Amino acid sequence: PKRLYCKNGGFFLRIHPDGRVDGVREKSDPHIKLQLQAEERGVVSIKGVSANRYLAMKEDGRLLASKSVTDECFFFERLESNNYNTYRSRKYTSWYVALKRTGQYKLGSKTGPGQKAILFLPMS
């Protein structure tokens, strides 16, 4: 599994068993272990290992994690020039997976390039 360390505050992306998404700084949290699975080159799904749920971005920018894999569950994974990764919705293509400084997720419609919120380092 991987954990996704967000540059914005040092929060790891967390997927709760019930589908809620947020961030936490605890490396020991069971709900931050993720499986990043390649769908094709540069395209991934993000599954919470504990939750058996896949990260999804909704049409209004909400993040949540669903039991089923749908078209809202795929993301462009890009290694940026600063060597952080970004995860951009394959369906809503201007919007990024992001965490705010409070550890709450950032609405997709409020994200974009240049923001710290969208930058993640995957780690083992």
Ligand X SMILES: CO[C@@H]1O[C@@H](C(=O)O)[C@@H](O[C@H]2O[C@H](COS(=O)(=O)O)[C@@H](O)[C@H](OS(=O)(=O)O)[C@H]2NS(=O)(=O)O)[C@H](O)[C@H]1OS(=O)(=O)O
Q: Measured from the CB of residue 80, what is the shortest distance to ligand X in angstroms?
A: 14
Which of 100, 105, 108, 120 binds ligand X (CB under 6 A)? It is 100
Q: Measured from the CB of residue 71, what is the shortest distance to ligand X in angstroms?
A: 26
Candidates 11-19, 28-36, 53-61, 113-121: pick the segment binding ligand X (CB under 6 A).
113-121
Q: What is the C-alpha end-to-end distance of the chain, expressed in Å?
A: 6
Residue 1 or 10: the one with the smaller Cβ distance to ligand X is: 10
Residue 23 or 74: the one with the smaller Cβ distance to ligand X is: 23
- List of residues contacting ligand X (CB under 6 A): 8, 100-101, 106, 110, 115-117
